[PDB]
Structure formats: C-alpha cells, structure tokens
Design brief:
This is part of a larger assembly, with two copies of chain A.
Chain A (H helix, E strand, L loop, with lengths): L2 H47 L1
C-alpha cells in the first residue's frame, strides 16, 4: 500500500542488478588473468629454449 | 616455473660445456706458447754454450 516500501524494493532490485554486473566483471577479470599467466609461462619457456 | 627449470637444466649443461671449452683453450694456448719459447731458448743456450 505504501510508496516507501516500493522505493525500498526498487533499491533492492537495483542492488541485485549491480551484484550481477560485478559478478560478470570479476569472472572476466579472472579469465583474463589466467590467460595472461599461461602466455607468460609459454614465453619464458620459449626464451629458455632460444 | 617447473617447465622453465626443465629447459634451464639443458641450457646450463650447454653453458658448462662452453665454459669448459673456453677455459681449456685459454690454458692450453698460454702453456704451449710458454713451452715453445722455453724450447727455443734452450736450443739457443746449447748453441751459445758451444
């Protein structure tokens, strides 16, 4: 019935949206770090062989 | 890092071979030069004594 409860629920849903976006960003960052580490290791081994 | 060390073992073996070659070459060159000089001096000394 009250509008203030609706406002609170709107803030809750916006926080949930922010949570989802932050989760996707963290997953992308972790994948990028893994790929960078793999590339660095391969480069170091190739330097040793050279 | 384990793979890098695996390559580094062979690299160090090759470096050890190169270092041994360089050291023995320098030592044998200096020793042979001094020996040849001593032999020539000895023959000259024999002739001078005569």
């Amino acid at each position: 019935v009250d509008q203030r409860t609706r406002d609170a629920l709107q803030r809750s849903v916006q926080l949930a949206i922010e949570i989802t976006t932050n989760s996707q960003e963290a997953a992308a960052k972790h994948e990028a770090q893994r790929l960078e580490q793999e590339a660095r290791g391969r480069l170091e081994r190739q330097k040793i062989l050279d | 890092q384990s793979e890098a060390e695996k390559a580094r073992k062979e690299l160090l073996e090759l470096e050890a071979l190169s270092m041994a070659v360089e050291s023995t070459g320098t030592a044998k060159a200096e020793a042979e030069s001094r020996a040849e000089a001593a032999r020539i001096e000895g023959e000259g000394s024999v002739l001078q004594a005569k």
